[PDB]
């Protein structure tokens, strides 16, 4: 895929080019490489790990054992460590056939004293989940999240890329700056709080696509 650190084991070649598009005339060449091998730099579930965790599951202090494991450097603060692993242990989709469609996902938040590893804990949660998100300082916006029209440099046509809240289909939405966020946005997260979806009203097309999501909020004082 595009956008990774890479190493190639390539041979070398060179091709001619036609100057005029409709003649056989040709003279400053263009080179290109031909790769033979490239290198960057459901899990296969075994049974020794299930046997290993059942020793840990035999230990009654697994709550306390997971209390001490989440902090390699953080001060103790037992109360915040409760819900974080609990939100990471994010329930399941206890869905009925008719009626309901409730999901067991909940939403914790925190605010208070500035820079108490408010970000590094969120960075630490980004470590423990492989497929997740990461919010930015106006990297996404109201119209910059989803619902795109953008005139791309390859074909100058339409492309509908999903927002980060839909992109966490199998993760935890880590999001910040919830006192400096603009009030043009901070209006569609109520829908993903409630109908678990994003309604798109764009010139392209309509779509009630869902978003299997799970959120936490890291606010700031004023």
């Amino acid at each position: 895929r595009a956008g990774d650190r890479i190493e190639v084991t390539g041979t070398f070649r060179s091709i001619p080019i036609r100057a005029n598009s409709r003649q056989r005339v040709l003279s400053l060449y263009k080179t290109y490489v031909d790769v033979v091998h490239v290198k960057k730099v459901v899990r296969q579930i075994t049974d020794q790990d299930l046997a290993k965790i059942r020793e840990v599951a035999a230990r009654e202090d697994l709550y306390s054992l997971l209390a001490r494991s989440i902090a390699p450097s953080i001060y103790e603060l037992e109360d915040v460590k409760k819900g974080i692993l609990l939100q990471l242990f994010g329930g399941t989709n206890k869905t009925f056939t008719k009626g309901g469609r409730y999901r067991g996902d909940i939403n914790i938040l925190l605010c208070g004293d500035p820079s108490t590893s408010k970000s590094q804990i969120l960075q630490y949660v980004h470590k423990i989940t492989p497929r997740g998100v990461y919010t930015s300082g106006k990297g996404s916006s109201a119209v910059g999240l989803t619902a795109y029209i953008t005139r791309d440099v390859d074909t100058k046509q339409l492309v509908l890329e999903s927002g980060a809240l839909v992109l966490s289909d199998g993760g935890v939405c880590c999001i910040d700056e919830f006192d400096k966020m603009s009030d043009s946005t901070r209006s569609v997260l109520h829908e993903v709080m409630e109908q678990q979806t994003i309604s798109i009203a764009k010139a392209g097309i309509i779509t009630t696509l869902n978003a299997r999501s799970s959120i936490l909020a890291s606010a700031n004082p004023i």
Partner: protein, 56 residues
């Protein structure tokens, strides 16, 4: 300087100072040629003119 090099300075040898900008990359230019017929093996040679040319 380049402000006064307009005249009889074509086909001559002049040093000019300045500031280098817009550096391109290194590309292979052509100076000789060898077409193969895969029958006789006489690789034909020719000189290279300006930036566009034509095979035989």
């Amino acid at each position: 300087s380049v402000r006064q090099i307009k005249g009889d300075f074509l086909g001559q040898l002049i040093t000019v100072r300045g500031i280098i900008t817009r550096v391109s990359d290194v590309k292979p230019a052509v100076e000789v040629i060898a077409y193969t017929c895969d029958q006789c093996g006489y690789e034909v040679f020719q000189e290279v003119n300006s930036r566009t040319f034509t095979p035989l």
